[PDB]
């Protein structure tokens, strides 16, 4: 309440779509994770492990994405970025996507 | 206001507009104009009734 | 028997904003002027409302001398 006048919040417009009366479209999302950060531990890294290691809240799917050096090991994910393919490509073999 | 007839100039082939008036009182009827679009690179432009 | 005229305009607040002997950057307004009381010299550009600004950075100087108007000279540093 900025006095009886129009507040600064009300004077500036709005941009995004509010949505329809059913709500939002429940689509899955992606979670970028740094390849200088999950390169600590070792093994054929998958879900059910990285969601237990402290990161990766038990929800939507992930993708490996960071600015740093990596370790040569296997990794199974759903997506990869157009630089982490090359930073991970150094002695690294991976499937680019799961069962879908 | 009510003499200016504020309008917008159309692409004259596809899509865009240019938002400048043309008077109804003075006989400035059907004024051709070259202006800069985005895609078509300085083609001609004409009026619209809006 | 009422008040005939008691309104007044809000001031546009013109004036000299950068005096001489001041280090400036490229883009500083040297003077906000109503009419062109100051004429452009070296590295000085005018705008729409006769406002002149600096083109380069350096120590500015006024009054090269008269007979045509007051001068503003943005002089570069070497």
């Amino acid at each position: 309440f900025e006095g009886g006048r129009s507040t600064t919040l009300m004077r500036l417009p709005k941009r995004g779509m509010q949505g329809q009366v059913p709500g939002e479209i429940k689509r899955p999302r992606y979670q970028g994770v740094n390849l200088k950060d999950l390169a600590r531990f070792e093994g054929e890294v998958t879900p059910e492990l990285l969601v237990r290691a402290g990161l990766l809240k038990k929800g939507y799917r992930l993708k490996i994405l960071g600015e740093g050096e990596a370790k040569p090991l296997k990794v199974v994910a759903h997506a990869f970025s157009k630089s982490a393919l090359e930073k991970l490509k150094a002695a690294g073999g991976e499937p680019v996507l799961l069962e879908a | 206001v009510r003499i200016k007839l504020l309008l917008e100039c159309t692409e004259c082939k596809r899509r865009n507009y240019a938002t400048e008036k043309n008077k109804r009182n003075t006989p400035n009827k059907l004024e051709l104009r070259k202006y800069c679009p985005w895609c078509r690179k300085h083609t001609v432009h004409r009026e619209v009734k809006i | 028997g009422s008040t005939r005229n008691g309104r007044d305009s809000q001031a546009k607040r013109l004036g000299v904003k950068r005096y001489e002997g001041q280090v400036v950057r490229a883009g500083n307004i040297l003077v906000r002027q109503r009419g062109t009381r100051f004429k452009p010299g070296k590295n000085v550009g005018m705008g729409r409302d006769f406002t002149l600004f600096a083109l380069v950075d350096g120590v500015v100087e006024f009054q090269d001398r008269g007979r045509l108007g007051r001068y503003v000279h943005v002089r570069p540093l070497a």
Binding site: T8, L9, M10, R11, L12, P13, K14, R15, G16, Q18 | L6, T19 | -
Partner: protein
């Protein structure tokens, strides 16, 4: 009970990571005719000064 997010604020402004509040500029939506390419074009997410300490208070639980 638990406080409610101001939906007008959530639909109008967007708070960034380092505390800054990003919102659009005004004087653009209704009438845009007698304006230059500068005055049409320069609607470029102005910043708010000394009000975000009273503007991130209603962007509160989800930020």
């Amino acid at each position: 009970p638990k406080m409610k997010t101001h939906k007008g604020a959530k639909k109008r402004v967007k708070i960034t990571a380092s505390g800054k509040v990003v919102a659009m500029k005004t004087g653009k939506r209704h009438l845009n005719w007698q304006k230059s390419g500068k005055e049409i074009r320069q609607k470029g997410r102005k910043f708010v000064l000394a009000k975000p300490e009273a503007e991130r208070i209603k962007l509160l639980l989800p930020y």
